Amino acid sequence: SQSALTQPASVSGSPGQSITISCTGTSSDVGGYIYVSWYQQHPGKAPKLMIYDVSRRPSGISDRFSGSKSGNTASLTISGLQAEDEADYYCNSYTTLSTWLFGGGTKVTVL
Amino acid sequence: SQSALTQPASVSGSPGQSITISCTGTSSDVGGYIYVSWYQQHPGKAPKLMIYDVSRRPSGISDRFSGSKSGNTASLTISGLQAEDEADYYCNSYTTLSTWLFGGGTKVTVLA
Amino acid sequence: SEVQLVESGGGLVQPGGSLRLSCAASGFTFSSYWMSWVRQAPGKGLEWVANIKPDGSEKYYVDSVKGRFTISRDNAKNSVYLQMNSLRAEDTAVYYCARVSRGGSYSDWGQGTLVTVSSGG
Amino acid sequence: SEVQLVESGGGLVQPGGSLRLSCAASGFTFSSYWMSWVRQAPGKGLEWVANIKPDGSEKYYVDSVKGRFTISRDNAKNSVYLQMNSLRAEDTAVYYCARVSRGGSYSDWGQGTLVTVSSGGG
Amino acid sequence: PKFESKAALLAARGPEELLCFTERLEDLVCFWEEAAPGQYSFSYQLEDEPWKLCRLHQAPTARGAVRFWCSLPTADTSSFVPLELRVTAASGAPRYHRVIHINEVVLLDAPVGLVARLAESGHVVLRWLPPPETPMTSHIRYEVDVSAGQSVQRVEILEGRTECVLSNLRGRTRYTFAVRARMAEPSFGGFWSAWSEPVSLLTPSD
Amino acid sequence: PKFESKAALLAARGPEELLCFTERLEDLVCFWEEAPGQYSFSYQLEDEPWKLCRLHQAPTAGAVRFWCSLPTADTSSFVPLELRVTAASGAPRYHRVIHINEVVLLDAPVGLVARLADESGHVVLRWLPPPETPMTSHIRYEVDVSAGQGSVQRVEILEGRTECVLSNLRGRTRYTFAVRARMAEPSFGGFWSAWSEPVSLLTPSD
Secondary structure, eight states: OOOOBBOOSEEEEOTTOOEEEEEEOOTTTTTTOSOEEEEEEOTTSOOEEEEBTTTBOOTTSOTTEEEEEETTEEEEEEOSOOGGGOSEEEEEEEOTTSOEEEBOOEEEEEO | OOOOBBOOSEEEEOTTOOEEEEEEOOTTTTTTOSOEEEEEEOTTSOOEEEEBTTTBOOTTOOTTEEEEEETTEEEEEEOSOOGGGOSEEEEEEEOTTSOEEEBOOEEEEEOO | OOOEEEEEOOEEEOTTOOEEEEEEEESSOGGGSOEEEEEEOTTSOEEEEEEEOTTSSOEEEOGGGTTTEEEEEETTTTEEEEEEOSOOGGGOEEEEEEEEOGGGOEEEEOOOEEEEEOOOO | OOOEEEEEOOEEEOTTOOEEEEEEEESSOGGGSOEEEEEEOTTSOEEEEEEEOTTSOOEEEOGGGTTTEEEEEETTTTEEEEEEOSOOGGGOEEEEEEEEOGGGOEEEEOOOEEEEEOOOOO | OHHHHHHHHHHHSOSSSOEEEBSSSSOOEEEEEEOOOOOEEEEEEETTSOOEEEOOEEEEETTTEEEEEEEOOGGGOOSSSOEEEEEEETTSOEEEEEEEOGGGSBOOOOOEEEEEEEOOOOOEEEEEEOOTTOSOGGGEEEEEEEEOOOOEEEEEEOTTOOEEEEOSOOTTOEEEEEEEEEEOOTTOOBOOOOOOOOEEEEOOOO | OHHHHHHHHHHHSSSSSOEEEBSSSSOOEEEEEEOOOOEEEEEEETTSOOEEEOEEEEEOOOOEEEEEEOOGGGOOSSSOEEEEEEETTSOEEEEEEEOGGGOBOOOOOEEEEEEEOSSSOOEEEEEEOOTTOSOGGGEEEEEEEEESOOOEEEEEEOTTOOEEEEOSOOTTOEEEEEEEEEEOSTTOOBOOOOOOOOEEEEOOOO
16 A cells, blocks of 8 residues: 555643644655645544645644644644643655555654 | 364374374363264375374274274374375364364375 | 434345445535445444535445445535445445545444344244 | 365454365265355364355355355356355354265364454453 | 164064164175975175175074074174175075175164153154164164154154154144154165164143 | 746737746635726635635737736646636636646746767757746756748657757758747646757757
């Protein structure tokens, strides 16, 4: 299968602190297009769109969530960490193979 | 699936010595019929009939191989153990369910 | 936020078996958006499976389902379909229906329908 | 010695696929003996699969194979057959053809044909 | 003691033909009866084994007839294999020629412990035990005989079941019951055993 | 400077209609040219409510060009972008529904070189993809073949391939070659770019 984008297995932080999740691919996907998005998933629930087009937010998403990318690595930043932010986070990118590719996923834990 | 007849995982012995392989079932199979047989299988080869009808030998089987059973347990004894005897050994029995049931198999190893 | 996606058609199936998933859409102009299927094996991550053009003239699949899965849609019935033939054990997952929006992002998700591919001991 | 059993029809198959095994017999009066199929998963033990009457009027199967496998025979061609439908991964084994003899024992064995059920395509 | 009784039973059915039967699937006896005495040779072929000769025995039966029997060696009593038999007169003439399987000529003992009892119901319940010292009782089917007048009733009992509930029986009659057994297992076969010891019972009225 | 060149290119083809194009899939400009008059430019993205775009105007000399540069936040792909140009009188001037990923206009290919083959005699053309453009593998090309005096030949180049070998050319003629590019990826689309800088070559004789 096509190898999923590389995300850290897990990141942790205290409430109020800021954390960042990385999403590394190639210049054939992440570094080749602006079509990069981020998703949040709580246990037993459907994924939720947090960031699209690298840095854009949907109408109901908090400004604590921000996105960026440099080179072939996209980054999701969560400022003012809260207990409700404890979830799985996935990135997604368009590829040269006319496919869409998710990342491995990052388990966020709040202390 | 139907649980295989209980055989020891592996038995070993020195050349010249005698070893015995056990085959435990119930009174509905091993202890219910005389239709108990033993088979020998060398690595990469097809199995070979050593004993049939509990104690009978086919033509060309060494008399070093002997079979018997008491209660619900059949036993295969190999006297004068040799290097060529190193193989897997399976027992087989008719069952009340009109099926035939192999044992788990026993690995015989001869130490020099 | 009124947008709703409801999957259907999952269940248990023998390996090699067939299965057809359905996704009823409402709350938006269905015929002008790409639709997608995304699956998630229990305890595992998200995996993109298939996309389909609004008019269905172009279709793309993840490698492992090509020749086995077929995505389709009925704009008059506001539905997306995923025909799953020759099902394998590794196809066992929760299958999500998703609306493709800005930048190809998946703005709306269904609750997913569970597909289990196994045999009996 | 004079008795010979040659299996055929094995190979790779996708799960759910079908496969038909054949066993050509020679060296004995084929039509007056029970015939049997025994399989062996790689590194595992022997497992009885099916028996068939000399006239083919009675057939028996191991439980996990009922409704999926069908044993048959053609006495005029001295052959035993095993139709295997809806193949599972646990059906992956070397399938032996055996002649049933005294006390139901398997006096003669074929060399076996390999049946592999997998998907691969990683 | 049990052989002659079973032999006479088989002699009762087709006294002229060749009769072979097994009791424990580790034995075989073939026997035929003729009018009084000729000399014969008993030969048999098992599986792939070469033809062998069986030592033929002879003894007179009351009413002056002679019984010729051969008790096959235990080593040659294997099941699920063709056993060809050939009885040849000393002249070279053929007397008998059969091909049997040991597992298909089973003759069990008669069932035991037959009990008849009434059910508030006016129905008769029969209960019995399988033939003693016999393994695999579960694969034995039975047949019960119901007789009153001068005149019978035969009921088939499925394998493993050792009891029978009878209805439609005439009131205030004296019924007598008996039950015999035989192998019913798919891979086995044989002949009906002798009838068990009978039991009687007087039914109630309407 | 690069916008005006591409605008004039699109103006040459269908001067009357509304012209929209993107360069980096992060931008969009729609423009039309007329013989000044007042208009209102409105657009609807995805399902978002209708927005108004600040409409600009400038003379081309004497025609006037009206263009709107969409906000970068509203330049998303794979979603319907409905456009409506309405006159100040309320009369409708234009009405289009486009996809941003389907109106790509790349730069012209560069580094076009024409050469004879070592022993063959045939002409091989080689060029480079449009500069500062990602995803080169999904760009297909078209080369133009022209000869002097009185005369045109178009050859389609498959995506990713940046060279062409031409046969069947007339001997001792002066050929001139040019190459343009466009998006060929299934999920994308657009228009032919401007021709590259041309190159000439004199063929040997047949």
